[PDB]
């Protein structure tokens, strides 16, 4: 689209084995028939290798789905209460507030460099801790963002009731 | 080849579940080795001290 | 589906479970290592101390 | 059968269970194949009206299978007949069938009588 | 039952209705005056079986149940040997062993549908293979006791 | 309120930067997941991220998803432009927990 991207394009995140082939063209690379195959060959690749991790046992994969798409789900709706509070806020510009660029950089630049960097999760620990504080640091922030959100619209509100003693 | 397949699932299977009894039997068989293998200590001590002793 | 790919599903399928269970092996043979040598240990300081 | 080899004792842990229609048996597999991995299979049989369905999976996920299984418009459980307590079940679960057809016809005829 | 039908079309007189009434009240009290273990552990041990106002109730097995439990079900057991011997001594068409059959093939019903332990003293004595046979002889209503009794039984094998 | 508003606007900053890179770092452990349960042997794969043109997603997840349908299944696998998925009565099920219809391959849609 146009009017949610400005430094920003979208992207397909996709995982096959070293095994896989495509049913298009057998005996190719998937690295090669990622960037050389693709629809009118200006598809951009970008790594996304994170850190490999340690399976526990086979009970807990089943339900780690469901937590990470529960927690995929709460992050994505705190993304949402977050750009609507701040579209809310009335200060989202043409370019900033729609794309967010972090870094001070594009979106594909920025993804493309990106590697399961954390500044307090370290690669000696569970995925379930590291989710687990990560969600309560999204719940943290967006329950922070709130509470200065419902003191905004109380001091507006009440700034508009002075407002409207004053003059009217 | 409809119980081929089953048939080396189940037998791989057999062989996970032969490999887990393994580690069960393992850490089972450890258990007891710890205290059999902690049990010895107090006999090189007791006559240690059994020397101290007669000596005075 | 197809009949020919259930055979192909179910060898990684069981793939996956002799791994699960191999790691799970892996897990229990390092447990009871972890806690074998500090209870001999522990057996051996509480014999020492009555022997004291 | 899919000679014992299931019903005597194994390795692997069956699911045997009575559908109508092989569109919710693609939908379980299919969504058991997307949401719990490669623990399902294909099976077709023809009954007299529902359909055989075979499906198998792990020993240690039995018990979530059941809520899924259940919540799929289908009655895939461990067991079908509820005699398991001997290798096979089948041999008393054909002897309370050839007791309960004499006994549903005697009461059938002091019915009608 | 004379007296139960007779209470509800009384006569003109008082007096028959007085008596009918006083009669029905002593008539239906005597036979639950007396205790089920004692008349149960009577007619089992007089070796006579007969029909009762108490005797067809769920409530007297229920309740002789737990105090006849006490040779892992030797007093059911006894009554299915007093049953099945009854019937291969003493064989069926006969009209002395229909009435204890039929009687001990409901109180063996209402026992065996009672409670789920006592199959397994029907099954290691052996008098379960003679009420599935006994279903199919003459004496239909004993055979309709014994359909119940083997209905009893079947369904706790399967559910 | 115009102290709440800044403060606000600098905690909406940090807090919306915070929870995208928790929902990158929750959408790639979701994507290893996702690969890592479902397929299995081996216990490696290659993960990564392609950026496609605006209006032109489609395409390369109809091509993608041509070419990488075979792994799912040869009857499962269709041409879908955009996100096919089951959105009838209750018998079939549409979900981010259970759902009877989805993807041919491990594919995940992040866009903003």
Redesign the interface.
């Known amino acids: 689209?146009?009017t949610?991207?400005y430094t920003?394009?979208?992207?397909?995140?996709?995982?096959?084995?070293?095994?896989?082939?495509?049913?298009?063209?057998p005996g190719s690379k998937?690295?090669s028939?990622?960037n050389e195959?693709?629809?009118?060959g200006?598809?951009?690749?970008?790594?996304?290798?994170?850190p490999?991790?340690?399976?526990?046992?086979?009970?807990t994969?089943?339900v780690?789905?469901?937590e990470?798409?529960?927690?995929?789900?709460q992050?994505?709706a705190?993304?949402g209460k977050?750009?609507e509070?701040?579209q809310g806020?009335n200060?989202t510009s043409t370019n900033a507030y729609?794309?967010?660029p972090?870094n001070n950089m594009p979106?594909?630049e920025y993804?493309?460099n990106?590697q399961?960097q954390?500044r307090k999760?370290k690669l000696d620990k569970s995925?379930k801790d590291?989710?687990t504080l990560?969600?309560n640091?999204?719940s943290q922030?967006?329950a922070?963002?709130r509470a200065?959100?419902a003191?905004?619209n109380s001091?507006?509100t009440?700034?508009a009731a002075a407002e409207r003693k004053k003059t009217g | 080849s409809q119980k081929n397949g089953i048939a080396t699932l189940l037998q791989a299977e057999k062989e996970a579940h032969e490999i887990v009894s393994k580690a069960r039997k393992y850490r089972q068989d450890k258990l007891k080795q710890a205290k059999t293998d902690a049990a010895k200590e107090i006999d090189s001590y007791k006559i240690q001290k059994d020397k101290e002793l007669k000596e005075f | 589906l197809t009949p020919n790919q259930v055979n192909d599903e179910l060898n990684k399928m069981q793939a996956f479970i002799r791994k699960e269970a191999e790691e799970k092996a892996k897990e229990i043979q390092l447990k009871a290592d972890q806690e074998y040598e500090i209870e001999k240990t522990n057996i051996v300081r509480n014999e020492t101390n009555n022997i004291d | 059968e899919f000679n014992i080899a299931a019903a005597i004792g194994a390795s692997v842990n069956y699911v045997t269970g009575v559908i109508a229609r092989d569109k919710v048996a693609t939908l379980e597999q299919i969504l058991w194949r997307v949401l719990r991995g490669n623990l399902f299979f294909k099976t077709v049989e023809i009954e007299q009206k529902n359909a055989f369905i075979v499906f198998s999976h792990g020993d240690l996920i039995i018990k979530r299978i059941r809520k899924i299984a259940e919540s799929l418009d289908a009655n895939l459980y461990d067991v079908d007949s509820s005699n398991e307590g001997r290798s096979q079940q089948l041999a008393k679960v054909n002897k309370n069938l050839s007791d309960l057809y004499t006994v549903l016809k005697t009461t059938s005829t002091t019915l009608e009588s | 039952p004379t007296v139960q039908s007779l209470s509800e079309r009384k006569y003109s007189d008082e007096e028959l209705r007085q008596d009918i009434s006083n009669l029905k009240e002593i008539l239906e009290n005597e036979y639950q005056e007396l205790t089920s273990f004692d008349e149960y552990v009577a007619e089992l041990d007089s070796k006579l079986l007969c029909w009762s106002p108490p005797h067809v109730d769920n409530g007297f097995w229920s309740d002789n149940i737990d105090e006849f439990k006490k040779d892992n079900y030797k007093i059911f057991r006894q009554l299915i040997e007093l049953l099945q011997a009854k019937v291969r001594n003493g064989d069926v068409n006969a009209k002395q062993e229909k009435i204890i059959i039929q009687v001990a093939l409901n109180d063996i019903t209402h026992v065996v549908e009672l409670l789920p332990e006592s199959i397994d003293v029907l099954d290691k004595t052996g008098g379960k293979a003679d009420i599935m046979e006994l279903l199919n002889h003459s004496d239909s209503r004993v055979k309709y006791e014994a359909l119940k009794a083997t209905q009893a039984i079947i369904g706790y094998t399967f559910k | 309120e115009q102290s709440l508003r800044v403060q606000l606007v600098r905690l909406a900053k940090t807090a919306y930067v915070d929870v995208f890179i928790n929902w990158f770092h929750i959408k790639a452990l979701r994507v290893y997941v996702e690969s890592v349960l479902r397929y299995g042997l081996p216990p490696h794969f290659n993960i990564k991220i392609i950026a496609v043109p605006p209006k032109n997603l489609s395409k390369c997840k109809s091509e993608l998803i041509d070419a990488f349908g075979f792994l799912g299944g040869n009857a499962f696998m269709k041409d879908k432009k955009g996100k096919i998925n089951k959105q009838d009565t209750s018998l079939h099920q549409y979900a981010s927990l259970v759902d009877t219809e989805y993807e041919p391959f491990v594919m995940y849609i992040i866009n903003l």
């Open positions: 689209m146009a949610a991207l920003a394009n979208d992207f397909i995140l996709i995982s096959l084995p070293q095994n896989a082939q495509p049913v298009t063209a998937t690295d028939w990622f195959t693709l629809i009118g200006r598809a951009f690749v970008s790594d996304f290798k994170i490999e991790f340690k399976i526990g046992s086979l009970d994969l089943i780690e789905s469901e990470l798409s529960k927690v995929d789900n992050i994505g705190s993304i977050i750009i509070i701040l806020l200060e729609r794309t967010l972090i979106v594909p993804l493309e990106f399961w954390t999760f995925i590291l989710i990560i969600s640091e999204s922030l967006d922070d963002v200065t959100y003191n905004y001091a507006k009440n700034l």
